[PDB]
């Protein structure tokens, strides 16, 4: 079943738009925020648009984008927190510790600027 991913940062909702831009919006009633993430392995996720069909990917520059094709850059790893919010990692760029993050202006974040402890790094699934 669907889920909205609520970022603690500014109270936005991860949004994959059809062109492939990933940002957050605070208009919970929007078509593109509905997200469906399936576990493809032990603590390994795939978040994907319920509407457009595309995927959450992060290129080798740290920019999260929407991909048509599930490809090596679509597996983020889930990791529950102490406060019960998640934290998704790029699996291709784990080494680096590049996460999924939104800024307080909506602009998605760059993997090479996601540090453990940011309020950006935390997302919390809602129905
Ligand atoms: O463009 S911004 O809007 O982000 O304007 C701020 C630029 O400064 C950064 C520097 O990078 S950082 O060292 O990793 O922080 O971040 C600092 O300011 C932003 C601005 O907020 S805003 O909502 O984007 O307008 C804060 O970003 S955010 O994560 O809060 O959204 C940074 O906070 S934090 O690092 O994430 O905790 C803040 O730095 S700090 O809190 O003092 O450490 C760049 O934003 S950043 O990449 O998100 O950090 C901004 O330039 S950038 O092109 O947006 O990256």
Swiss-Prot record:
The keyword Manganese does not apply. In the nucleus, phosphorylated by PKC/PRKCD. One of its GO terms (molecular function) is fibroblast growth factor receptor binding. Keywords: Acetylation, Angiogenesis, Cytoplasm, Developmental protein, Differentiation, Growth factor, Heparin-binding, Mitogen, Nucleus, Phosphoprotein, Secreted. It is found in: Secreted; Cytoplasm; Cytoplasm, Cell cortex; Cytoplasm, Cytosol. Signal peptide: none annotated. GO terms for biological process: activation of protein kinase B activity; angiogenesis; branch elongation involved in ureteric bud branching; cellular response to heat; epithelial cell proliferation; fibroblast growth factor receptor signaling pathway; lung development; mesonephric epithelium development. Monomer. Homodimer. Interacts with FGFR1, FGFR2, FGFR3 and FGFR4. Affinity between fibroblast growth factors (FGFs) and their receptors is increased by heparan sulfate glycosaminoglycans that function as coreceptors. Found in a complex with FGFBP1, FGF1 and FGF2. Interacts with FGFBP1. Part of a Cu(2+)-dependent multiprotein aggregate containing FGF1, S100A13 and SYT1. Interacts with S100A13. Interacts with FGFBP1. Interacts with LRRC59. Interacts with CSNKA, CSNKB and FIBP. While binding with LRRC59, CSNKA and FIBP seem mutually exclusive, CSNKB and FIBP may cooperatively interact with FGF1. Belongs to the heparin-binding growth factors family. Plays an important role in the regulation of cell survival, cell division, angiogenesis, cell differentiation and cell migration. Functions as a potent mitogen in vitro. Acts as a ligand for FGFR1 and integrins. Binds to FGFR1 in the presence of heparin leading to FGFR1 dimerization and activation via sequential autophosphorylation on tyrosine residues which act as docking sites for interacting proteins, leading to the activation of several signaling cascades. Binds to integrin ITGAV:ITGB3. This is Fibroblast growth factor 1. It comes from Bos taurus (Bovine). The chain holds residues 25 to 151 of 155 of the full protein.
């Amino acid at each position: 079943k669907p889920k909205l991913l609520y970022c603690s940062n500014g109270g936005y909702f991860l949004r994959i738009l059809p062109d492939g831009t990933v940002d957050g919006t605070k208009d919970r009633s929007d078509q593109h925020i509905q997200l469906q993430l399936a576990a493809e392995s032990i603590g390994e996720v795939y978040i994907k648009s319920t509407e457009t069909g595309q995927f959450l990917a992060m290129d080798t520059d740290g920019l999260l984008y929407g991909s048509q094709t599930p490809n090596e850059e679509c597996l983020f790893l889930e990791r529950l927190e102490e406060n019960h919010y998640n934290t998704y990692i790029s699996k291709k760029h784990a080494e680096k510790h590049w996460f999924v993050g939104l800024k307080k202006n909506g602009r998605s974040k760059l993997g090479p600027r996601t540090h453990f402890g940011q309020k950006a790094i935390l997302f919390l699934p809602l129905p």
